């Protein structure tokens, strides 16, 4: 893993509306195949940088588990930021519709 | 709307996609056997199926 700060900055630029107009202008004379190939090439460049530079270079976060810990941290951040938020919303929804635990209730007895 | 309430259908939402990076691996992995091979020894299968 690497360039997390650059990724945050990319997300910021993406949400900035002015960049929406800039991208609208850049998309003049452009194809979906070209856009897809460019994105795929960017991702491949990132992963190739990793594969090459891990052989001789060590980041500030280097540890006896290597990039496994950084990847687990990315996963855990994604989890706590998105999935647990969705769980909170679903919990409030279920509590308003059926009551807390309503989705695990037993079938009506016959 | 008595017999029309079980007709309001909504589709599932599962996506069956997972990147398969094999360049990361260099060893084989174990695999399950799901069914007995009936293409060989077909005539004796009921007679040797209970053994091991």
């Amino acid at each position: 893993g690497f360039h997390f700060q650059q990724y945050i900055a990319m997300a910021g630029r993406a949400i900035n509306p002015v960049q929406w107009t800039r991208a609208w202008r850049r998309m003049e004379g452009k194809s979906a195949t070209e856009v897809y190939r460019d994105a795929l090439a960017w991702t491949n460049n990132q992963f190739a940088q990793i594969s090459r530079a891990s052989q001789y270079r060590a980041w500030w976060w280097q540890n006896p588990l290597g990039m496994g810990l950084v990847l687990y941290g990315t996963y855990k951040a994604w989890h706590m930021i998105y999935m647990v938020r969705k769980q909170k919303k679903t919990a409030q929804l279920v509590a308003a519709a059926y009551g807390q635990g309503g989705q695990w209730l037993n079938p009506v007895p016959r | 709307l008595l017999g029309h309430t079980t007709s309001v259908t909504m589709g599932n939402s599962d996506i069956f996609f997972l990147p398969k990076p094999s360049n990361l691996l260099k060893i084989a992995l174990p695999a399950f056997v799901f069914m007995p091979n009936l293409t060989i020894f077909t005539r004796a299968f009921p007679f040797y199926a209970h053994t091991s």
């Binding site: 491949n44 190739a48 | 398969k20």
Partner: protein, 31 residues
């Protein structure tokens, strides 16, 4: 002559393709 063009690094260093894995058999999956 002198050099004035701003030379990108992609014209020099080409990255390997690692996103999609290699096919050493050179045959498609259905085959």
């Amino acid at each position: 002559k002198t050099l004035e063009r701003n030379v990108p690094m992609k014209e020099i260093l080409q990255p390997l393709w690692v996103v999609e894995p290699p096919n050493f058999l050179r045959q498609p999956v259905w085959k």
